[PDB]
Amino acid sequence: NLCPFGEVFNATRFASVYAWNRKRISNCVADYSVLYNSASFSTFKCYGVSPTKLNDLCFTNVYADSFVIRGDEVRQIAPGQTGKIADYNYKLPDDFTGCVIAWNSNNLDSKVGGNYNYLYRLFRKSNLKPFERDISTEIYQAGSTPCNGVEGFNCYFPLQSYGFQPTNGVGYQPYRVVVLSFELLHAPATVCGP
Amino acid sequence: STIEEQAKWFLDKFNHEAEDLFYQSSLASWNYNTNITEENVQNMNNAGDKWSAFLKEQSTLAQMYPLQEIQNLTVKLQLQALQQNGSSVLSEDKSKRLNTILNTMSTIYSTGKVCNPDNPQECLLLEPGLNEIMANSLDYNERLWAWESWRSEVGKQLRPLYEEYVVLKNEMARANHYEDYGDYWRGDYEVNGVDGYDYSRGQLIEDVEHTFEEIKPLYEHLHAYVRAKLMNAYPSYISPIGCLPAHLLGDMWGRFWTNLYSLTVPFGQKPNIDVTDAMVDQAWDAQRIFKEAEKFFVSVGLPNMTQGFWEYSMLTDPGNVQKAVCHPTAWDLGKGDFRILMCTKVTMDDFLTAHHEMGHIQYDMAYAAQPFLLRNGANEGFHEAVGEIMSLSAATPKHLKSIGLLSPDFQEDNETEINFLLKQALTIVGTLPFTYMLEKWRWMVFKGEIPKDQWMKKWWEMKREIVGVVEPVPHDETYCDPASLFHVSNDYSFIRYYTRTLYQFQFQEALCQAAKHEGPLHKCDISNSTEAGQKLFNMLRLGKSEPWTLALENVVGAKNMNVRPLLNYFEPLFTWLKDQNKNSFVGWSTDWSPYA
Ligand SMILES: *[C@@H]1O[C@H](CO)[C@@H](O)[C@H](O)[C@H]1NC(C)=O
Ligand SMILES: *[C@@H]1O[C@H](CO)[C@@H](O)[C@H](O)[C@H]1NC(C)=O
Ligand SMILES: *[C@@H]1O[C@H](CO)[C@@H](O)[C@H](O)[C@H]1NC(C)=O
Ligand SMILES: *[C@@H]1O[C@H](CO)[C@@H](O)[C@H](O)[C@H]1NC(C)=O
Ligand SMILES: *[C@@H]1O[C@H](CO)[C@@H](O)[C@H](O)[C@H]1NC(C)=O
């Protein structure tokens, strides 16, 4: 009854971080250490748990959030962080128990001349609360003068393209991120280790 | 809501947008500079156009935030860099014409060939062919042939281009609200918003001249000692009272006198302080040269080179497979991409140059976290100085002994120290009148002080007067000898190499004091000193976030350029030269010519 982690981790296309995707996982057996050695992940940090310990835990659901960011920014996918990604795109709660997993995706997501399809939100009037998701596109009013879904002075389209060229430094290269949240409700624990 | 916070958000936008457009312009230029082709000229033009158009729109917006209401010095500095429109103030036709001029000049410079009278189809480029002659030849006529062919066959091509370049560049500069292109270039040293740390564009000329007055006696005596030695190197060819012939100075121009060391060495029987022969026997190659520079920086606590540096740099000549601009350049392309472009040879010259160019990369890496507009040396002289501070330690006999290029039983005399100081002077002191004179000529051209029919007439008068060097062939206003040098035909400011040379000793004093150094400054090697690494890095990481005058004072305790640390470094050689010259002519007459 193995869990379909492959669908998430080995997906061909990844969401932009402003529009991060969530897959619900249930009714299956998950081997988290088999997933740990499933590749070389540049980041594999579990916060309320340990991987080898997860294989003797059971949860009612697991949620897998996936998106792309640059290397510099993987540090923002952790509780208590701030910055453009954590404030405006994807916010983990302070009491997070779950795993953050990341790997370098330069060979999939960068393109000679630049791949620009991955976006992030540059401006927002306040910070996202944990797991919130903003896909709106109104023009950000940075000034007195009220704009009008028209870019202009003090008025900025709020989303920006990453630009991934294979020649970028490793900080600037694309990284694919999978966040796993482990949920336990008063209901049958349907996702178990072996 | 406030202007300073509106400007903060605007810069936020600008920095993110700018970084990719700059980077795409850098890649296109890299392609042209490693692979000269017309297809790559047009891509460099297209990416340069795209970047300049974006810069024009963005600077128009930046100029709407009054700087009078900006407290954050770093917000004010970023907006200050966007106060002029830039290159885009030229019409489409003039901008296209200016680009065509720059690309023809740069292509002519590193692909132009001269061919032999003796051989109709041998063909030599400046690099390696003519440079090898101008560095190794001891034959008056061979050296004269390379020096004159280069200027006659390539310099004449550049003369009409250079005339129109002056016109268009000045037009650009007047629209950017400068007097002329030279005034524009001196703007790199301007500092405006900071009380007691300001520096006007006019102050730079006076500081260069006032400080150059203090360098003259040392140069006069190096000049006289070299001229006496050249008399036996070139019997019949050297006047005892005249300028030195321009083609006998060790490179295509006399920019450095380094390659005169073999002819002027004070104590020729001591172990060789030039480690060229030693690295050839040890089978060194370009890779070991750049790996050794890397290990030197790691010794003071600075990072390794990145993986992309080692993967994407061009560290040797690719062949005739493709045409490169061989002139050593340190590239900060953006987005963590750092490269050096260099056609390295197994010489001590290129060993030291590898250390200096990597120092510039070290600088680029240290301020990469700075916001885009402040990712720059505190001024062009700082950026040109860092690598040279390093090579001052990398050149010391003690350092060369410790990397195995001197015998493990090499012992230092007063004689070996005079040898080292003499070779150091041939490079460092020899270049100062060269550098001041070249740039004053350009400043005078730019401000309209030299009629076109007297360009080369004034050029050679100033060589004779300031530099004590004389052309071996009379030269027409069909020539354009300044443009036969890389920096003139590739549109680079040159006074950076003057201010840098004074800075590098000011800095070296402070780094060696941090390393708790024992004795005179020329024996100091900051290797393995992470204290010295730390003081250097803390200045490097600032970029242009602080005015250079405050930045300099934080390291060395002075707000201005100062000649005293350079003169003190060379003092033991200065005392020696004065005694050596006691039976020789010192000074030069400008009337003698090799030709008559
Ligand atoms: C991704 O694909 C590889 C290659 O088939 C496979 O070995 C690996 O287990 C897959 N990853 C996951 C999480 O299923
Ligand atoms: C040089 O440029 C041409 C096009 O300008 C390109 O097709 C060629 O592959 C390049 N050569 C190298 C060695 O990269
Ligand atoms: C404004 O200046 C302060 C220090 O004076 C600095 O910490 C801050 O980062 C600056 N503003 C921004 C947006 O960086
Ligand atoms: C260039 O910037 C200046 C501000 O100094 C501005 O007045 C001018 O409009 C800009 N160029 C254009 C597009 O006219
Ligand atoms: C210190 O530097 C010397 C050469 O200057 C070198 O031989 C030695 O290995 C270095 N020592 C350490 C601990 O790095």
Numbering used by the authors:
A (entry chain B): 334 to 527
B (entry chain A): 19 to 614
Share the article's original sentences.
Previous studies have shown that the human angiotensin-converting enzyme 2 (ACE2) is a functional cellular receptor for SARS-CoV-2.2,13 ACE2 is a type I trans-membrane protein with a large N-terminal ecto-domain, which can be further divided into a peptidase domain (PD) possessing the carboxypeptidase activity and a collectrin-like domain (CLD) mediating ACE2 homodimerization.
The determined affinities were 10.1 ± 1.2 nM, 13.6 ± 1.8 nM, 76.7 ± 10.3 nM, and 19.3 ± 0.9 nM for ACE2[W19/Y330], ACE2[W27/Y330], ACE2[W19/W27], and ACE2[W19/W27/Y330], respectively. For W27, it projected its indole ring into an apolar pocket constituted by residues F456, Y473, A475, Y489 in S-RBD, making 35 vdw contacts for strong hydrophobic interactions. Such engagement significantly outperformed T27, which only made 15 contacts with the apolar pocket. For Y330, the amino acid was shown to make 16 vdw contacts and one H-bond with P499 in S-RBD. Sterically, Y330 and W19/W27 were distantly located from each other and devoid of any steric interference.
